[PDB]
C-alpha cells in the first residue's frame, strides 16, 4: 500500500504483522513488553530499497517514520508513551523493519 507521511509520498505501509516478542535482559522488562506490546506498532512505513545504498538507512527511516506516525495517531486517542515505551517500540519496530528489508532484498 502506498502512503504519504509528513507531506511526502512514496512510502509504503506494510502489512499487519505478527509483532515479535522482544527480550530485554530482565524478566520484568520482558513482562512489561508482553503487557504493553498491543500499544506498539504492528506495521511499518518504509520506502523502496532503491532509495538507499544500505540496509541501515532503510531501517532507520522505517523506524523513525513508523514511530513518528504512530505517536501522532495514538496521541489523538489519549495515548502517552513513557521512555520505556519508546525504547521498546524502537526495538520491535527495528525488527519488523529489518524483516521488511529482507523481503525487499530477496525481491
Amino acid at each position, epitope marked *: 500500500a502506498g502512503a504519504v507521511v509528513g507531506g511526502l509520498g512514496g512510502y509504503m505501509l506494510g502489512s499487519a504483522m505478527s509483532r515479535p516478542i522482544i527480550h530485554f535482559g530482565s524478566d520484568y522488562e520482558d513482562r512489561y513488553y508482553r503487557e504493553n506490546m498491543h500499544r506498539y506498532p504492528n506495521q511499518v512505513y518504509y520506502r523502496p530499497m532503491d532509495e538507499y545504498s544500505n540496509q541501515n*538507512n532503510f531501517v532507520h527511516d522505517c523506524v523513525n517514520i513508523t514511530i513518528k506516525q504512530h505517536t501522532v495517531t495514538t496521541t489523538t486517542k489519549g495515548e502517552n508513551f513513557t521512555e520505556t515505551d519508546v525504547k521498546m517500540m524502537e526495538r520491535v519496530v527495528e525488527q519488523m523493519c529489518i524483516t521488511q528489508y529482507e523481503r525487499e532484498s530477496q525481491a
Partner: nanobody
Amino acid sequence: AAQLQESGGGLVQPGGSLRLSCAASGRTFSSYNMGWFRQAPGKGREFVASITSSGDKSDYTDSVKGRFTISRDNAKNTMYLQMNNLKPEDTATYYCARGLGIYIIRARGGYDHWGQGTQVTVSS
C-alpha cells in the same frame, strides 16, 4: 526557482579535512530542512547528513557519523558540511538538496532541488 550551489570540494590527503558549502538563492532557506548526499562513479547517490530547518536536529549516515558535521547559517542562506578525518571511501561528488515533507529522512526521495555538485577526492 530556489537554486542550490555546492562549493568547497577538492583533492585532500587521507586524514585531511574539508568544509563544503551549499548556497541557496531565494528567500525561503530557513523554512526547509536540508541535506547532503554523495555519488561516486558506479554507485548511486546516497545519504550523508541532514539538518532541520531550524537547525534543532541533525542526522548522519553511519559511515560518516563522528567525522562529519552538518550545520546551517540561516542568516546567510548557507549550509555547511565539515568533513574531518577523510578516508578514500569518501571520494565522491557531494550534492546538497532541500527536504521534501516535514521530516528529515535518509532516502533519496526525501529531497529535491539538487545542486550540480562539488567533487571531493581523497587520495590513497
